[PDB]
Design a protein around this ligand. Structure first.
Ligand SMILES: Nc1ncnc2c1ncn2[C@@H]1O[C@H](COP(=O)(O)O)[C@@H](O)[C@H]1O
Ligand SMILES: Nc1ncnc2c1ncn2[C@@H]1O[C@H](COP(=O)(O)O)[C@@H](O)[C@H]1O
Ligand SMILES: Nc1ncnc2c1ncn2[C@@H]1O[C@H](COP(=O)(O)O)[C@@H](O)[C@H]1O
Ligand SMILES: [Cl-]
Ligand SMILES: [Mg+2]
Ligand SMILES: [Mg+2]
Ligand SMILES: [Mg+2]
Ligand SMILES: [Mg+2]
Ligand SMILES: [Mg+2]
Lengths: 91, 86, 84
């Protein structure tokens, strides 16, 4: 059977790659995945972070700090969803 | 905290401009595209991700792209829900 | 529309061929793969997405890739539902 984990998505400009990774890591996430992305909002010059955490509270802390620091001045969207992972694994 | 719909459309790279036009014309605030490869029934393809506050616009955009390109082009599509801010 | 299951596997690019074989030999109708980078416990990784008509098929694919590769390679895997 399975354990609930939270998946935090942050899509932002590529220039924020180092700062946002450091925020994810200093908040205690076990890792993150980055994908190269393009898009339009309101080539592949955006980055999509996906951060998995078994703590909904850790996902909120990361999202809150990235939104406070960079949402005003940088193209940034963010959202959260749940996924199921194997009980034996650690997120 | 609001519930939002995520529409994924995986199709051939060559449809990039035409599908982006369908998404923008239906009134979606934007979209994300990623490079992809894969196998199916019929790097090569593009994955669209479109977030829409209403399920109706998600379905609307899906209807259009499917009608116009499904039977002629490599093309899969699905919808999930996510939690966003505002 | 109907509920389907989406299996994600994130692993090293060196396992591409061998994970795709597990996927197709298990009876999945297909798979998608995206280049990825990241850190755990640049774009050296790949993310599989496998849509399956049943949970059990997603579970059997995940059980096999994990049993073969989780201990010696980078292997993140999780499952969610979508409507198609
Ligand atoms: N409705 C949407 N659906 C999916 N992705 C979006 C949407 N709106 C914005 N984005 C993504 O967020 C990026 C930045 O948004 P913005 O800050 O509005 O420029 C875009 O380039 C897209 O990658
Ligand atoms: N079961 C599946 N799971 C994930 N992606 C799929 C699946 N079937 C097809 N695809 C994707 O859709 C593309 C085109 O599908 P097709 O029209 O069946 O050739 C493939 O190259 C894959 O990227
Ligand atoms: N908590 C996480 N959230 C998102 N992606 C992760 C997470 N942990 C690991 N990853 C991804 O999985 C890859 C392998 O992780 P590892 O198995 O710890 O080397 C990493 O390089 C990331 O792409
Ligand atoms: Cl940065
Ligand atoms: Mg600035
Ligand atoms: Mg797992
Ligand atoms: Mg799982
Ligand atoms: Mg997919
Ligand atoms: Mg795992």
């Amino acid at each position: 059977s399975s354990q609930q984990v939270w998946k935090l998505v942050i899509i932002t400009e590529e220039i924020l790659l180092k700062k946002v990774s450091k925020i994810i890591k200093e908040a205690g996430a076990s890792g993150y995945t980055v994908l190269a992305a393009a898009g339009e909002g309101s080539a592949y010059s955006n980055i999509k972070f996906e951060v998995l955490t078994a703590s909904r509270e850790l996902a909120d802390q990361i999202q809150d700090k990235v939104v406070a620091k960079y949402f005003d001045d940088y193209s940034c969207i963010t959202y959260i969803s749940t996924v199921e992972a194997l009980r034996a694994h650690k997120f």
